[PDB]
């Protein structure tokens, strides 16, 4: 999933981001780390209905 | 004659470009010495003269960016419900309460 | 006072990063009182690891064993 | 001592033309440090309930059965198994 | 009526049917650029977040990142890494996708445009070209050109510190006058990194109306100018009212057309 998530960005290397990309994106792999803060990782991009114009 | 200005951009559209701009990113956004400082102050009522490890406070500065991420993740979604753009501390206690903080 | 470190600015930087459109006055001393608190427990269980270890510097690790304690496991730092 | 040159050699039969970061590395490093823990205690609890002194392939299959979701856990007992097999035949 | 036409012709100043007394201008021009921006180490690519088909046009077809995109909505076009491709509507001040124009006399205020056929709300109009000045030429040049007797100053403050001159070079938005009543507006939008300033359209203008924009008021000198609209409210002076010995005496009208005459 990680290198997926890499090629899908025109890269090689595999970073931490998509790490994070690569797990949070996946329905098991995030219950199976719900609890897990990895280190420059970040979030996922998303913005609530309700506050576009 | 005079130097006629174009425009200004409405309210919350400069907003949610930061939301992006800053949601796209991974680095730290807390100012490093600073933190390094409050640290040091808060770790002294504990065990005076004490030494510490760079890595040892980059664990905590992630760490409490982390937590505060998804304290203000939370905190949105409270407003929200509320049916407020504006976050109120009121939310953020509504927040922790329910989480169980 | 080097809470009043955390600045305005930065509090809004993390906002922004957790999806806020606009900011009350209020939140900054709210965020810098829960902060405090946070840091403070971590801290006191960080300093507790280290005391028991018969270290005076207060290594990595410790904060890592001190954040798996309270339940929030951190990659990167082993 | 780490899993790092294990990590790689997972890596390049899965994706043969790519790289990965030490700070990636570390990561997994404690991702699978942290699965291991999982799994090996989920496993020293389930052959103290049953009062045995060996930790078996049983074992771990219970505990790996009882962590992991369905469709993950349904492939990994299925390597499991087919590695066992292979193991003795 | 604009015939723009590369041979320089015998029309002095007014620019009403021959443009070729000073040159045009495509995408405005620098002085003093250098590599300190935002440019390219994080505003690297913002991509939308789309999952075209792409395959089904002009039937059931929809058109690509129309107003639910989120690059759109945030005054942002998108770049050639858009999924899109080349079926990417945002890029209109790359593909230079423009509107029907032309330049005559409407009142003696000054020349203006007026809309050739209907054209409905946010329409893109024409971009906003210069030439870009900087810190210190922007105080010496003004004080050197206002005592040249000019009645219009294309001046335009794209930041805090940089203002964009279009009267050496100009394309043709540099004819659009003021009014009270706009129906036209300027927005600020972000092109590779780059700020640059466009014109859009509010409402259902009919074809043969006026397309002005409102001017943010300002004033420069100790002097003022009055607007010459009066729709309903006209502000009626350019800029508001706020601000931030011997006589060679002159020959007679009489005489002035007797030494015309005499040549």
Same mark, same amino acid.
């Given at each position: /999933? &990680? ?7 025109? @890269?090689?290397?595999?970073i931490?981001?998509?790490? +994070? /990309? &690569?797990?949070?994106?996946?329905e098991?792999?995030? @219950?199976?780390?719900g609890?897990?803060?990895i280190? +420059? ?13 | 004659?005079?130097?006629?200005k ?12 930061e ?5 796209k ?18 770790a ?12 040892a406070?980059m ?30 501390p009121?939310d953020?206690?509504?927040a922790?309460?329910?989480?169980g903080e | 006072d080097?809470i ?14 957790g ?6 006055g209020?939140?900054y001393?709210?965020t ?8 403070e ?13 018969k ?24 | ?6 990590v ?7 994706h043969?033309?790519?790289?990965i ?12 440090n ?5 799994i090996a ?15 078996t ?19 990994a007992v299925?390597?499991?198994?087919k590695?066992v ?5 | ?5 590369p041979?320089r ?13 000073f040159?045009?201008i ?6 003093t650029?250098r ?11 913002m ?21 639910d ?32 124009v032309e330049?005559?006399?409407?009142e ?38 206002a ?7 294309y001046?335009?403050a794209?930041?805090n ?7 050496q ?5 540099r ?11 300027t ?5 590779n ?13 009919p074809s043969?109306?006026?397309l002005?924009?409102?001017?943010q ?32 005496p ?13 040549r």
């Open positions: /999933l &990680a290198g997926n998530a890499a090629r899908d960005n025109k @890269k090689t290397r595999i931490p981001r998509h790490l +994070q /990309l &690569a797990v949070r994106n996946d098991e792999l995030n @219950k199976l780390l609890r897990v803060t280190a +420059q990782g970040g979030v996922l991009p998303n913005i609530q209905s309700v506050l576009l114009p | 004659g005079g130097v006629m174009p425009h200004r951009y409405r309210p919350g559209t400069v907003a949610l470009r939301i992006r701009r800053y949601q990113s991974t680095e730290l956004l807390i100012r490093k010495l600073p933190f390094q400082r409050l640290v040091r102050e808060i002294q009522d504990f065990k005076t003269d004490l030494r510490f490890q760079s890595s406070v664990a905590l500065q992630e760490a409490s960016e982390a937590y505060l991420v998804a304290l203000f993740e939370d905190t949105n979604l409270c407003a929200i419900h509320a049916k407020r753009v504006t976050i109120m009121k953020i206690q509504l922790r309460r329910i989480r | 080097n009043q470190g955390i600045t305005k600015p930065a509090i809004r930087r993390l906002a922004r990063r999806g806020v459109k606009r900011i009350s209020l939140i001393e709210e810098r009182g829960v902060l405090k608190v946070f840091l427990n971590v801290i006191r269980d960080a300093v507790t690891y280290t005391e028991h270890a270290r005076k510097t207060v290594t990595a690790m410790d904060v890592v064993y001190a954040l798996k304690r309270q339940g929030r496991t951190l990659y990167g730092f082993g | 001592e780490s899993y790092a040159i294990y790689y050699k997972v890596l390049k039969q899965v043969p033309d790519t790289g970061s030490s700070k990636a590395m570390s990561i997994m490093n404690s991702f699978v942290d699965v291991f823990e999982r205690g989920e496993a020293s609890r389930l052959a103290h309930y049953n009062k045995r002194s060996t930790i392939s049983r074992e771990i299959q219970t505990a790996v059965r009882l962590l992991l979701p369905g469709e993950l856990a349904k492939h299925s390597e499991g198994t590695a097999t292979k193991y003795t035949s | 009526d604009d015939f723009r036409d041979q012709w015998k029309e002095c100043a007014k620019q009403g049917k021959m443009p070729c007394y040159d045009l495509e995408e405005n021009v620098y002085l650029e590599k300190k921006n935002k440019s390219h180490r994080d505003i690297k690519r991509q939308c977040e789309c999952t075209p088909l792409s395959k089904d046009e002009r039937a059931q077809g929809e058109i690509a990142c129309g107003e995109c989120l690059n759109r909505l945030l005054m942002i076009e998108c770049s050639s890494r858009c999924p899109n491709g080349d079926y990417c509507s945002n890029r209109r001040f790359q593909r230079k996708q423009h509107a029907d330049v005559i006399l409407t003696k205020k000054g020349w203006g445009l007026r809309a050739a056929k209907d054209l409905p709300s946010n329409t893109f109009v024409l971009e906003y070209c210069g030439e870009v000045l900087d810190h210190k030429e922007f105080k010496a040049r003004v004080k050197e050109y005592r040249n007797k000019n009645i219009h100053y001046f335009m794209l930041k510190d940089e203002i964009i001159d279009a009267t070079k100009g394309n043709c938005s004819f659009m006058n003021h009014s009270c009543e706009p129906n036209c507006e927005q600020k939008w972000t092109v990194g780059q700020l640059r300033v466009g014109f859009f359209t509010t409402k259902l203008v043969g109306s006026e002005t924009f409102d001017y008021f300002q004033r420069y000198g100790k002097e003022a100018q009055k607007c010459f609209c009066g729709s309903a409210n006209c502000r009626g002076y350019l800029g508001g009212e706020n601000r931030v010995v011997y006589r060679i002159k020959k007679s009208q009489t005489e002035k057309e007797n030494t015309t005459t005499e």
